[PDB]
Amino acid sequence: VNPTVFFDIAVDGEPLGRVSFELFADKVPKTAENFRALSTGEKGFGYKGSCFHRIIPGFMCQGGDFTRHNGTGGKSIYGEKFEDENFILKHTGPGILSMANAGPNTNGSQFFICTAKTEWLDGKHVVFGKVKEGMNIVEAMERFGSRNGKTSKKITIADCGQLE
Amino acid sequence: PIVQNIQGQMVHQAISPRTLNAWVKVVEEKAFSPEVIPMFSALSEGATPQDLNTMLNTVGGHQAAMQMLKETINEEAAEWDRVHPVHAGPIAPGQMREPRGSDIAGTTSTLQEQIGWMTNNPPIPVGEIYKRWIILGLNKIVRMYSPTSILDIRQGPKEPFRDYVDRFYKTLRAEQASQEVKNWMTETLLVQNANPDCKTILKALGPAATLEEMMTACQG
């Protein structure tokens, strides 16, 4: 019933590990379909070969800008941006997968994986999934980031797709 | 529309162009007759809401009737939301999607969501609900397209009973009422508005006589 997608992560081309995500399509369906479809690449464009452009140790890893590769772009499968579906789920801990945005109703394709409890984000970013397998791969990724987000090595989504 | 595919697994099959051409032709040739409702219900068996939206968009002309149909679909969706709101209750162990007034009308529901709601166990009857709504709208339209009221149906001086009863029953079928009202009307209005020459004949047969007896009586 709820889809599961994976990401094979790479640090400058060396394979690092697989993170897999359960998308809560039963509560945030339109948000979950957009991450699912961008992971499969079935609509022609997507996450494969994009990188995490902003990694802040102890906060979150952000990625998903496949058009401009630096947080200023990305687009959804419904057009460039769409509404905040709802705020049922909250940022309760590491592994929560939440939507990045540029204020309300500006969701595109950027997402962030929390590596800590970030309750201040509640009510401001739609949560739509959580890490299933691979959280120590997300944790190891932190080491390649910095206080301001700049990463030291290129961290890419080498491959991604749907598992179930 | 989805169809049972060998073996036992329903898969989505897009609407065939020949079905759309048949629908366009029947709406062009027959306009808005009482019989179109059955032809529409039979041309779109088990159709996803997207297929019914396609079949309602492919119509040419009669834009006023299509507007009444859309407005009645909106009203049914509004009433459906009012009759089916989420009251607080313990969450079910198993989660299945749910169709909103706008999710049933195929406006904001993607094709995959409708395929899910249909093929899931237990199935959600979104197609049949949208078909009931469209059928109510088509009933409204065909009752509006009635040229004259059923009360005005009267036989000509030399108009044969054949054409008279044909036109009378056609207008009565186009007219809207409960079945008991029709049972009373066929006994109170049919014999009275007939031509006096054959009205005497029908009166000689009896009040509770059937249609075939009167028809063979005034035959010729």
Added chain:
Amino acid sequence: PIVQNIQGQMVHQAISPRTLNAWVKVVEEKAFSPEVIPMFSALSEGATPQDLNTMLNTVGGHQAAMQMLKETINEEAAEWDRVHPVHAGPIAPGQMREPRGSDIAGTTSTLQEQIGWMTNNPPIPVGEIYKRWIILGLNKIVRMYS
């Protein structure tokens, strides 16, 4: 109709638009000739009462003949209900209830009950009785039309 899958269950299948198009074409072009009854019995083979009601409702015009046919169906249903008692109460699972005349006509049931009655063991054919009634009605019509 009810197409019998090759080495498989007799899967139900909605009436194709071609059948209804041919039926409305013949009933429009040829009026009510004696041969239409054979062509009607040919087009509708192994069809549920829902299919026969759809084939009858699609007829446009000649509403007196349709009313006579409905009256004949009602008389046959009344006779069937009179000469056959209808059981009630709790019914054992896996066994459908007694088909009523108004139910054998398909006016007070859905497709599921008809499919169940046409798949029971031993089979109880509702189609071959409702078609018989429609043929009696069409015979009365073509006699009246002469």
Added chain:
Amino acid sequence: PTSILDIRQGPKEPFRDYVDRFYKTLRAEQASQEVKNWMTETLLVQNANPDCKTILKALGPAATLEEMMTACQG
């Protein structure tokens, strides 16, 4: 004397006499009350004078008898 279907208002015959005669003939007539519920809403407004017909149709189909009356009052 006459059937309920034959009741029709004159050109200048006031609405009062028309509705009085119509309801009198309807009460004298024999039918189930359920049929009368449709008969009134189908026959009362239709057989009225054209000006009063439009006046009653401006009120609505399900308008009560008192509102329909006070519409064409005088």
Added chain:
Amino acid sequence: PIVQNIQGQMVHQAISPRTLNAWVKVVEEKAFSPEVIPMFSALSEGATPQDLNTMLNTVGGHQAAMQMLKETINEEAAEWDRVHPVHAGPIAPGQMREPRGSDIAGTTSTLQEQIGWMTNNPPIPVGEIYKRWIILGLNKIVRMYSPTSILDIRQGPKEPFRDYVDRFYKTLRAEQASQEVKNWMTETLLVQNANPDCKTILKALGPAATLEEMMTACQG
């Protein structure tokens, strides 16, 4: 009605032919004047809903007024049934069930149930509620029969003050306004609508004007 026997149990009694003849006579003779409601409340005292339905059905003519009265009774019964839940199930012996609106209207009950509801302990004034509904309906009817409005009464140059105030109080009795608004009307418009001569007379009379001193001043 229900006549109370001397030092004994109250016995039911059919409505008198004299009572019904007087009722139909006053209806036929005076049409619907404002006093028909007091005379009806006088003739029908302690009567069952069956008696009240008989007294209403014996009325011949004014079928529009009768249908309006029946519609008012239906509205009152609907409001009663909406604001009063109806219990069901097994009922203890010696205790009548909950009277529904259609039963208090007398359209779905019998004389036995009416007498039972009027003899219970504590009694339930089914007759006094159905009579209240009939009085509301008769008030609507007498308001509809009002030929002219109250705000449009003007005294004629020759028409005397006695006749003017007679017409004014008749229209006031027919008026539908509440009693609190009804007082200000007879305090102001009575002297504000009269002829100029006695208008200035009552103005010189000033405040605390009562009908007796007004009529003694406008003499001659």
Added chain:
Amino acid sequence: PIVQNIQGQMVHQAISPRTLNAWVKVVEEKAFSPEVIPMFSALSEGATPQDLNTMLNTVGGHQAAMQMLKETINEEAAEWDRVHPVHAGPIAPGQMREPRGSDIAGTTSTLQEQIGWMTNNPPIPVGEIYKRWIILGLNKIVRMYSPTSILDIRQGPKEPFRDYVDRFYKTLRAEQASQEVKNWMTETLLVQNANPDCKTILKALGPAATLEEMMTACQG
């Protein structure tokens, strides 16, 4: 007035010259309009009876209205003294004596007694009663000042509906009747006194007539 210090005692403060200047300006420029009463109640908030006597004495001219206001204050004080017994004798310390009507008017006391009565526990508000009496007097004055009555308003043939409803609602604000009578008249006489064309327009509008709907109907 009595300004409440921020986190402190409610310190007394003499009326600023700006308040009295605005009061004399409005009573000079605007005469006695219905709105002056709201502006008077606005300027004087939490003011001692000495402040209200100063605000009333500063009024120049219209001495008949001032005499009527003083007579109304005297009548209210007499009623208060009649329906409230006044205790005497030795009074316990820390508890002020019974306020008399002539004392609640502030004519037979100093500022100290008023400040004590407006600071006691529980508080006994003299200001909110003396202001109520002054408002009753000003209401009598503005009723007396009204040039035309409410029952005698008629729309001119060329004068539009906006000016007519302006005059009608102004006179209604000047009216003395109770609120239910006010609702009755603003419901009936508004459409009952308009010009015949828009009168028939509003009659076609039917019941539930609402002011914005009326003004949108009578446009042009």
Added chain:
Amino acid sequence: PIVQNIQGQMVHQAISPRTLNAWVKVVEEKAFSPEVIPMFSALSEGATPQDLNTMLNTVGGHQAAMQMLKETINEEAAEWDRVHPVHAGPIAPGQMREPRGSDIAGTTSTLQEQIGWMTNNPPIPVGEIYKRWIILGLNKIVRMYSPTSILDIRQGPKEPFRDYVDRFYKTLRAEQASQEVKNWMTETLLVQNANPDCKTILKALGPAATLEEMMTACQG
């Protein structure tokens, strides 16, 4: 209106007279124009419902507009009561009960209750809600006081383009039907109603033309 202190807390403060004077002057001098709503929103920042009822009752004249505003406030209050129903059962120790639809207006509540509602923990913005309602009422009032519709605009042969666009945007800001419909109107109706010479001068720049070049084209 409440005001913050040095320690940071707020407490009630008497309404300043030259605010009431400025509001009455701007209401009378400018009558009703789109620029009365910003002035009203700026004058009564943080004002209690009593202060807003003061600022509304103090407006002498234009009583029809004030009655429209009262009716709009009335309907808005009813909607608030319907949307949220008070909960039953025991109340938490740290929390106390809320106001009703009519008490948001401040019609049946004292000033101390308004201050407690506004400075509670957490604070309840009754003043902002009633200000929003009054702003909506003033929007409807300035809509009614619009002297024409948006479609009837047609520039005269001699009326300069500056006056035409001024009138257009005036009645467009006074329309307030929507915001995107306004964006479509300023593209279509602005270019569709120009004088033929300057009309084709504007057509020379195509639809991509902005307003500045649009006016400097017809300029000089």
